[PDB]
Design an enzyme around this catalytic site. Sequence first.
Site, PDB file in Angstrom:
ATOM      1  N   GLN A  31       0.825  -1.203   0.000  1.00  0.00           N
ATOM      2  CA  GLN A  31       0.000   0.000   0.000  1.00  0.00           C
ATOM      3  C   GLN A  31       0.862   1.257   0.000  1.00  0.00           C
ATOM      4  O   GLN A  31       0.629   2.184  -0.791  1.00  0.00           O
ATOM      5  CB  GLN A  31      -0.936  -0.034   1.208  1.00  0.00           C
ATOM      6  N   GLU A  36      -4.838  -5.946  -1.757  1.00  0.00           N
ATOM      7  CA  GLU A  36      -6.042  -5.321  -1.223  1.00  0.00           C
ATOM      8  C   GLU A  36      -6.539  -4.320  -2.254  1.00  0.00           C
ATOM      9  O   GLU A  36      -5.819  -3.361  -2.573  1.00  0.00           O
ATOM     10  CB  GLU A  36      -5.750  -4.632   0.109  1.00  0.00           C
ATOM     11  N   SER A  67       7.074  -1.354   1.575  1.00  0.00           N
ATOM     12  CA  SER A  67       7.073  -1.112   3.009  1.00  0.00           C
ATOM     13  C   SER A  67       7.311  -2.431   3.728  1.00  0.00           C
ATOM     14  O   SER A  67       6.563  -3.396   3.535  1.00  0.00           O
ATOM     15  CB  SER A  67       5.751  -0.487   3.445  1.00  0.00           C
ATOM     16  N   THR A 126       1.581  -8.132   2.991  1.00  0.00           N
ATOM     17  CA  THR A 126       1.617  -8.355   1.551  1.00  0.00           C
ATOM     18  C   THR A 126       2.836  -7.702   0.922  1.00  0.00           C
ATOM     19  O   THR A 126       3.472  -8.285   0.038  1.00  0.00           O
ATOM     20  CB  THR A 126       0.329  -7.850   0.897  1.00  0.00           C
ATOM     21  N   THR A 159       2.931   1.689  13.461  1.00  0.00           N
ATOM     22  CA  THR A 159       1.491   1.479  13.407  1.00  0.00           C
ATOM     23  C   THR A 159       1.117   0.083  13.890  1.00  0.00           C
ATOM     24  O   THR A 159       0.306  -0.069  14.809  1.00  0.00           O
ATOM     25  CB  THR A 159       0.984   1.701  11.981  1.00  0.00           C
ATOM     26  N   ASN A 213      10.514   6.821   8.417  1.00  0.00           N
ATOM     27  CA  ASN A 213       9.488   7.860   8.344  1.00  0.00           C
ATOM     28  C   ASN A 213       9.739   9.028   9.288  1.00  0.00           C
ATOM     29  O   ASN A 213       9.605  10.187   8.872  1.00  0.00           O
ATOM     30  CB  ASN A 213       8.113   7.269   8.645  1.00  0.00           C
ATOM     31  N   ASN A 221       5.688  11.227   0.209  1.00  0.00           N
ATOM     32  CA  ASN A 221       5.808  10.669  -1.130  1.00  0.00           C
ATOM     33  C   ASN A 221       6.395  11.684  -2.099  1.00  0.00           C
ATOM     34  O   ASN A 221       7.164  11.322  -2.995  1.00  0.00           O
ATOM     35  CB  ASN A 221       4.445  10.180  -1.611  1.00  0.00           C
ATOM     36  N   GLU A 280      27.035   2.778 -12.122  1.00  0.00           N
ATOM     37  CA  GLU A 280      28.105   3.599 -11.578  1.00  0.00           C
ATOM     38  C   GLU A 280      27.998   3.790 -10.070  1.00  0.00           C
ATOM     39  O   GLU A 280      28.918   4.339  -9.458  1.00  0.00           O
ATOM     40  CB  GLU A 280      28.124   4.962 -12.270  1.00  0.00           C
TER      41      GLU A 280
HETATM   42  N1  LIG Z   1       6.592   6.654   4.226  1.00  0.00           N
HETATM   43  C1  LIG Z   1       5.409   6.094   3.994  1.00  0.00           C
HETATM   44  N2  LIG Z   1       5.078   4.910   4.618  1.00  0.00           N
HETATM   45  C2  LIG Z   1       3.878   4.332   4.390  1.00  0.00           C
HETATM   46  C3  LIG Z   1       2.972   4.923   3.528  1.00  0.00           C
HETATM   47  N3  LIG Z   1       1.873   4.147   3.485  1.00  0.00           N
HETATM   48  C4  LIG Z   1       2.063   3.080   4.293  1.00  0.00           C
HETATM   49  N4  LIG Z   1       3.299   3.186   4.869  1.00  0.00           N
HETATM   50  C5  LIG Z   1       3.913   2.231   5.805  1.00  0.00           C
HETATM   51  O1  LIG Z   1       3.325   0.956   5.650  1.00  0.00           O
HETATM   52  C6  LIG Z   1       3.159   0.342   6.908  1.00  0.00           C
HETATM   53  C7  LIG Z   1       1.971  -0.613   6.898  1.00  0.00           C
HETATM   54  O2  LIG Z   1       1.926  -1.343   5.693  1.00  0.00           O
HETATM   55  P1  LIG Z   1       1.000  -0.801   4.498  1.00  0.00           P
HETATM   56  O3  LIG Z   1       1.842  -0.129   3.442  1.00  0.00           O
HETATM   57  O4  LIG Z   1      -0.031   0.141   5.063  1.00  0.00           O
HETATM   58  O5  LIG Z   1       0.275  -2.092   3.881  1.00  0.00           O
HETATM   59  P2  LIG Z   1       1.153  -3.243   3.194  1.00  0.00           P
HETATM   60  O6  LIG Z   1       2.623  -2.931   3.309  1.00  0.00           O
HETATM   61  O7  LIG Z   1       0.726  -3.380   1.756  1.00  0.00           O
HETATM   62  O8  LIG Z   1       0.770  -4.570   4.012  1.00  0.00           O
HETATM   63  P3  LIG Z   1      -0.771  -4.837   4.371  1.00  0.00           P
HETATM   64  O9  LIG Z   1      -1.105  -4.053   5.614  1.00  0.00           O
HETATM   65  O10 LIG Z   1      -0.990  -6.309   4.616  1.00  0.00           O
HETATM   66  O11 LIG Z   1      -1.640  -4.363   3.235  1.00  0.00           O
HETATM   67  C8  LIG Z   1       2.967   1.482   7.890  1.00  0.00           C
HETATM   68  O12 LIG Z   1       3.594   1.189   9.115  1.00  0.00           O
HETATM   69  C9  LIG Z   1       3.644   2.664   7.236  1.00  0.00           C
HETATM   70  O13 LIG Z   1       4.860   2.931   7.889  1.00  0.00           O
HETATM   71  C10 LIG Z   1       3.297   6.112   2.898  1.00  0.00           C
HETATM   72  O14 LIG Z   1       2.498   6.642   2.132  1.00  0.00           O
HETATM   73  N5  LIG Z   1       4.520   6.697   3.133  1.00  0.00           N
HETATM   74 MG   LIG Z   2      -1.726  -3.995   1.334  1.00  0.00          MG
END
Ligand SMILES: Nc1nc2c(ncn2[C@@H]2O[C@H](COP(=O)(O)OP(=O)(O)OP(=O)(O)O)[C@@H](O)[C@H]2O)c(=O)[nH]1
Ligand SMILES: [Mg+2]
EC number: 3.6.5.-
Lengths: 430, 439, 439, 439, 163
Positions: C11, C71, C140, C145, C179, C206, C228, C254
């Site tokens: 995500q 998702e 992430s 996932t 989180t 972050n 982002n 490089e």
């Molecule tokens: N820097 C940054 N981190 C993000 C962002 N969106 C989600 N995260 C990180 O992603 C972590 C949670 O995972 P998600 O990206 O929300 O979802 P996922 O990685 O696809 O895994 P699932 O929860 O199973 O869907 C959070 O702890 C955030 O730190 C974003 O837009 N910017």
């Molecule tokens: Mg996800």
Amino acid sequence: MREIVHIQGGQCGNQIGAKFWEVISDEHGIDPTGTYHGDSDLQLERINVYYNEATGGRYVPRAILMDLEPGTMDSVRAGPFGQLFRPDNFVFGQTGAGNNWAKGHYTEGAELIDSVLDVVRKEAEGCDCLQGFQITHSLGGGTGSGMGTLLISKVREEYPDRIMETFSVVPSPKVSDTVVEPYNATLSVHQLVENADECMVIDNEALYDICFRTLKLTTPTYGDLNHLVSAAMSGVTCCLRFPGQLNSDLRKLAVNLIPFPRLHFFMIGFAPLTSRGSQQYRALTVPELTQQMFDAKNMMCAADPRHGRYLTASALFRGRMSTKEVDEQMLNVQNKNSSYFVEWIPNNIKSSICDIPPKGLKMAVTFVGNSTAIQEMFKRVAEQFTAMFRRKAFLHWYTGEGMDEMEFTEAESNMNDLVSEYQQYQDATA
Amino acid sequence: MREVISIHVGQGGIQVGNACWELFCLEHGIQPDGQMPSDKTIGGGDDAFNTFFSETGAGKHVPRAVFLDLEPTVIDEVRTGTYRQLFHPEQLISGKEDAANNFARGHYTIGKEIVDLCLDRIRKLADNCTGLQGFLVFNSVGGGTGSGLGSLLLERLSVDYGKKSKLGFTIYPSPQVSTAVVEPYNSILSTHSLLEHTDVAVMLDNEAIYDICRRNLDIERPTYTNLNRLIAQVISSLTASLRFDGALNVDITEFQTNLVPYPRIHFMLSSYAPIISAEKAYHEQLSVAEITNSAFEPANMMAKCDPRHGKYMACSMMYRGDVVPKDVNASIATIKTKRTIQFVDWCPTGFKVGINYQPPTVVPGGDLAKVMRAVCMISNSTAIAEVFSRLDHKFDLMYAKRAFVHWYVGEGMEEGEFSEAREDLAALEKDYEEVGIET
Amino acid sequence: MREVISIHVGQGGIQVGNACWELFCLEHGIQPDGQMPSDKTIGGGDDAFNTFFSETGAGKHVPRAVFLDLEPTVIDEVRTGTYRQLFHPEQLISGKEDAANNFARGHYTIGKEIVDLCLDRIRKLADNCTGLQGFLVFNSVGGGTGSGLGSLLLERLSVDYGKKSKLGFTIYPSPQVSTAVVEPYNSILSTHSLLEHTDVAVMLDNEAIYDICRRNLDIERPTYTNLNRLIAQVISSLTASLRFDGALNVDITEFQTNLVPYPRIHFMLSSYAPIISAEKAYHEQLSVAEITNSAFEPANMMAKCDPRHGKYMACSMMYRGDVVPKDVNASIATIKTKRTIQFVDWCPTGFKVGINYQPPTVVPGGDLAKVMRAVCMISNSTAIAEVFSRLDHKFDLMYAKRAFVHWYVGEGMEEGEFSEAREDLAALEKDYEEVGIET
Amino acid sequence: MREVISIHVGQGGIQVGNACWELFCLEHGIQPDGQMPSDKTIGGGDDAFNTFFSETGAGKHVPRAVFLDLEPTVIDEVRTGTYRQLFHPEQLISGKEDAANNFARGHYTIGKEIVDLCLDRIRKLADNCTGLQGFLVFNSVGGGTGSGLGSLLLERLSVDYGKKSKLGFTIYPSPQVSTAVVEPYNSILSTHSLLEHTDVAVMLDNEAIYDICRRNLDIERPTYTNLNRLIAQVISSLTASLRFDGALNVDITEFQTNLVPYPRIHFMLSSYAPIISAEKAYHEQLSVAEITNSAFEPANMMAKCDPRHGKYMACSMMYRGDVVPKDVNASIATIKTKRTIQFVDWCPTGFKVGINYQPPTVVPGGDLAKVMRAVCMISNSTAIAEVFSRLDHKFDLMYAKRAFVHWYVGEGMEEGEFSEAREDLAALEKDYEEVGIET
Amino acid sequence: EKFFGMTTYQQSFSRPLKETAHQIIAQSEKKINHFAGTNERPVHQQSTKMTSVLTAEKYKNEQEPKDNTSIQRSWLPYKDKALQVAENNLIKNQTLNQTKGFTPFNPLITYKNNMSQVQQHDIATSLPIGSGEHSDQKRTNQPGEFRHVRTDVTLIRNKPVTK
Ligand SMILES: Nc1nc2c(ncn2[C@@H]2O[C@H](COP(=O)(O)OP(=O)(O)OP(=O)(O)O)[C@@H](O)[C@H]2O)c(=O)[nH]1
Ligand SMILES: [Mg+2]
Ligand SMILES: Nc1nc2c(ncn2[C@@H]2O[C@H](COP(=O)(O)OP(=O)(O)OP(=O)(O)O)[C@@H](O)[C@H]2O)c(=O)[nH]1
Ligand SMILES: Nc1nc2c(ncn2[C@@H]2O[C@H](COP(=O)(O)OP(=O)(O)OP(=O)(O)O)[C@@H](O)[C@H]2O)c(=O)[nH]1
Ligand SMILES: Nc1nc2c(ncn2[C@@H]2O[C@H](COP(=O)(O)OP(=O)(O)O)[C@@H](O)[C@H]2O)c(=O)[nH]1
Ligand SMILES: [Mg+2]
Ligand SMILES: [Mg+2]
């Protein structure tokens, strides 16, 4: 934003606060519905000092309405400007204190103070950078004199670094209002000397004399006295709310007026006070303001300041003027009245300037003073207390709530110690 | 290429900074918004402004000054004032809670979380500078944040840079007329701090300027703005030598090598002339001899000190305008022939003169008139010990019974500091009275 | 004729991809629909956009990237957003059930039926391009996932393509700001998978960017969009050398050849300078000296790590704008003279500098200002082991009591994986320890 | 072939001996079981441990220590602690009945039945010794049995050995706060006893080091353990010269021949620097000037005594680490230049400096941090008269009403014994007064 | 009952009292192509604000003789070549400024650099490297100005099959 909260308990405190809040709303251009309708931008950058913000663009005072009976608050809300105070800030008992210090401080006060302490804690934690507390109460009543000082003790225990400023109305011996007055008076003032950083005394005799002899009102009510008290209240925090050439906040006043930790009792005064007859026939200027603000008959206390000597004094000029007249008048009045100022401390006059006068005026002066003449009040009260206590009159009502005479005795001894140590500076020479 | 860094700490410091930066902006012809109104191009072969202003590259210029205070009132007022587009926004360091006229609050409790930011900004400012000459610091001593924070910054820069010169235009309290009651305490403490950290100190009390305004401008209702304008004029007249032509150009270095015989004796009192309104200006002579004679008369001293009660050691006189060196030295010789000013025996020659070619600028809405000649004089005298003696008296009379001591003690200040401050003030006055003896 | 392939999994990966593709679409002037709006565009040899876009035979251009997520909400949001006509309809692969923060879900059970389609898409997009430079992946770590699909695709690609360069801009969990509650587990698993399958790994913590945004842009409540956008700026500054001519250009090949001394160590952290708001942009100098000094400040790290606790081994700096090699060399000399930053003994020279002419572009409605000089910095330092140690502490504190491990054993993977991954991480920390020892 | 014999009498002596011996064994690499592990690098450095230990011939080592006490709880705790394996099980002499804070009981009634075996063990230990330098004794003066046994042991050894060197680290009560109520009596009597029976005495009152650990360590609930840790660190810093090479060696002999202007004046007070909290990410580096400035700072003094009130006679101070003698000399020059540090008239030179190359060791799980430079200072100054004056006033107030005097008369001690102690303390105060005056 | 409210700072200096609706809209377009940042001062341009045209003196010329210098320097046995040279420099500078158009609020600004004899090009005693390649550079800042061109030499299609 060095913002402060308000707490008021007892009917006297409730009335004082009711008038004070509408005075502040008038100064800041706030309607009874809580919507800003001012003219200049200067009324909004410091609005958060006294008013919190809510949805819909409205503002709400951060004041706590506390009492042991609902009638006073039923009246204060039913009056004008009752829409400002939030309903959650109302806390009330249902039995009343019976003008009994024990009932208001130990039995009902102790069990009910939890909610008021909780709302005080949440309000204090909501604000960004708390500056201090200001309290309004009467020492001759039950609910105020007991539960207000109990809450004082608790908040001092919880917040040691913050400062507290109290406006206490004390009995004058002439106007007798209650037969058990000295008892709860001493049982209250016994705990002020350890907790209150600033205490400022107000007298109904002084208010009556001033309103009759300066204002020349034939039939004064409590409203005009409350107005005088509110004006003297708002004058103190002027520099903290508006720009000026020499800003001074409550901690500056405390540090710069307190020589010793147990001499924090003050007498206050306001200028210019003029009758409605000659409002237009006299010149409002720094010399006349200075001449009036040092007159003994303008003071808000029954004690005569010319029977003692000033330790420190402070004047907070408001409006647009030049510092030359201010400092020159302070120096000249210190030079001409060298007998009325103690000699081992030089230059004991405080000059502060704020650039916003009150609405409808040009220049205003708020004066606060520490002098060795305030102890006449304490001597009278102590003598009256001894006369009533020597045979244990009215004692059983107090003792029936678990009270004992040892605390009465030590409070009376504390009065004697205070008056002795406070008068021994009068003749102290380096 | 040549630059000076300005520090304005405390309420008085900020209120002097406003006037001095207004004066500099007017003098260099920069608009309040910050844009130079074109018409200064054509290869523009002169950086008359790098001393005080640095270009952003295209259009506007920014000052090399920093503002410090613990109360956000004046800082936010400046941020919202007519100069909102001039100062760099985050070099306006604003505190949160006022020092409450207490030295301990500003020196031991709240100053640490501000001095780090201030030093970081001073480092960043100095990095862009390539030829730094020194520091100017403006502060009031009778105020908590002023004294405490100024002392702490002086200490920190003293170890960060060291040999770099720093000059302090401090405002000490007047003898009788004053605002607070606790000012002797923090004044003694701040002079303790600055004695071994400031290369040059200048006396700038208020009542002398009040009396000068009363006598010369005939204004009976003066405010702080007039005093600020006078002090700004003094600063500009002193510093104009770095950015304007002259027959005898004088650098700030010609202070800690010509006005200070001994490392401990570096306190001086200044004077300025002529001071004439616009009504009496056209009816006067305003010759070099007259403006020089009026500069040395006691009532024109910026500080409440009587020079006839002490001797003279070193005088630096800067002239600006169409002045002639022949007239300058003629006036100096006349002064020497005149008796009531007597110099010390071991200093036969005691005058350092500088000439600058830019006549003083006039501020609209100001009190001073437009003149073609002016002089600024800085004097080192042994009569200055009187103010220190009277301050010591005001200190110890009320210290004898330990008043207000708890306010400092409970904040974290050790009680023993007052004793050693008394000690080194006694040592300093002993040195001053020892120097005055004949050889 | 040189192209790179972008992978966005998770995500957070999709959210980062949205912003970076917005920036790329803007900087080549591509309209949101996908077609060239100028109508003055010419053919011949102006195909600079080929590094990111491909001509579609009729009109528009399609990006060379894939979106993977189990998702469907974010993919549906992209398909209904303002960029509906940009992406290929069968290029945003969508799952049916989310992994629900479980690594086993995405690595053993569900990802097997999505990895085949993703690989088919990658192959069919890959045979289109002819000058494949490499793959960039965004994921992430602290997501089920994301971590699972990232690991599985990395293992598949490592055997399907072989020697092609891989750069992973990975979002590790913060040491205290997080989180989920189970992210240490799948972070361990992802690190074990990633250690021996990626060529370059870039920290993207972050709270570091949070602090930078709060300190510089004066924003009290940044959201993921600002994050982002800064990530997009970093990626564009990294990649601009492949599509814009400059004095000293660099390539994807490089960086690893000049940044990783040993195959095992390939983790490093970044910085970007300057970060200036619109109002701030006026009253500052913006020279190469100050921007390069700001780039090395510990507060400007893109990851929550303090380099002062470790040594430096390699760093690559890319400047874009009107910089000059002499000035950047002088800045390098000043840095080398500086003592707070020290290098490892066996690396006398550790600077790889590139220069590009194209100044950064600004996204309308953004927060950051624009200046014509920017620097992006990629340093590998010994101090990076701190975050691994912290995450190891988190893993131990909950693996002692075998918490949540039933929802890891219940999807087929054995409990023995935790010990293996822990041992691998311990060996990695060992290596990062002995790499910094003096001979 | 150099050694020193250690005596621990009283409870506080026991808990301080535990700490110092823990520090010694950790520094010299001796495990708690006493077996030196051969797996360590090389092994057996010359005979470094010979100062404190003696080889058994095959196996472990035996410290040159003895523990004396009349209350068995502390000795039982030591015997049941992890150091059960180390000490000789017959040198932990335990009595049966405590003196119950009564000096007469510990000096006339019970201590005579243990002093014989104590001196026998002393003789047995001394027979093994061949190049013995002296004795260290640890005792709290405010405890009955500790004071009585320490005294008796002292006047016994004074005739048993003669000119042998003795150093006593007395734990004096705090100026205004304490746990005892009759401790003025026993402190005065013990001071009377040991005035003419010891060579060096060191003042170690508790509240000063309370303030030290509060201000420096930033610890708000430290216990006696940390206090003993600081005392042990000071002891090791003092004694490292006997067992480790240095630029300038100074043994136990070069303390009383340097710090003792007259035989009666042998009471000295200590300080140590730097003291840095362990829970800090960055420790910077510090340097010689900073550490010596901190050491001479009056509030860092380990005894509640302000040197500002008195004159200095002697200052013997030890550096350990990588200090440079030029830096040492520059620091001494600056201190002598400083005005607040003033010497007596007749002592133009009053500094002894010792140098050692080994940095101080850090105990795992301790509160101190690792620093490469440290200094320990021992001073003899006139300001020490104030503690004696306060104890004299307290004991006078005690003896005004003859309180508690019967429970000292009842154990055979003469009634008028207190008067002799009165007169001798008065004589010592007069001696301190007359020494400080200039000719 | 009027609030007043004109603080000392405002009454002393000013109060802005601005922001017409179209004022901000008009101000906006100034930042469309105004670009934050800078070059460096090219050295030998930094100097004190020169006032006199003559060294160690005021050159003041005015009708009254006590302050005309040229009248006061005439005691020499000869004409001092300096006064009239400065006269020529001033009049020539005025004419030269007339050609370009500067009106820089006084003639003294451009007189600094109207006197240099440095030619634009070299005079055959150094390599004709010119004044610098960077000097002849002009910069716009529109996106996509510095993309590659792929000329014919590198423009190949067919990748010949055999060797
Ligand atoms: N820097 C940054 N981190 C993000 C962002 N969106 C989600 N995260 C990180 O992603 C972590 C949670 O995972 P998600 O990206 O929300 O979802 P996922 O990685 O696809 O895994 P699932 O929860 O199973 O869907 C959070 O702890 C955030 O730190 C974003 O837009 N910017
Ligand atoms: Mg996800
Ligand atoms: N001459 C002159 N003196 C000023 C001015 N403003 C403040 N002062 C001096 O400042 C002294 C008091 O200190 P303040 O400046 O008011 O306050 P501070 O220095 O910021 O210290 P704090 O009160 O703790 O905030 C007064 O005695 C004045 O003499 C000014 O505008 N002109
Ligand atoms: N520095 C330090 N002093 C201690 C410690 N424990 C006790 N003391 C001191 O010891 C004094 C009293 O002596 P005790 O510790 O009770 O033991 P003692 O000296 O043998 O006397 P008795 O209690 O009769 O056995 C007190 O005044 C304390 O100051 C400690 O852990 N550290
Ligand atoms: N100035 C003023 N004083 C008041 C007012 N109401 C009551 N008081 C004073 O309060 C005193 C009685 O206090 P009391 O009501 O018994 O205190 P409580 O029982 O705690 O509420 C009287 O002496 C009055 O003078 C008011 O509206 N204004
Ligand atoms: Mg202030
Ligand atoms: Mg014991």
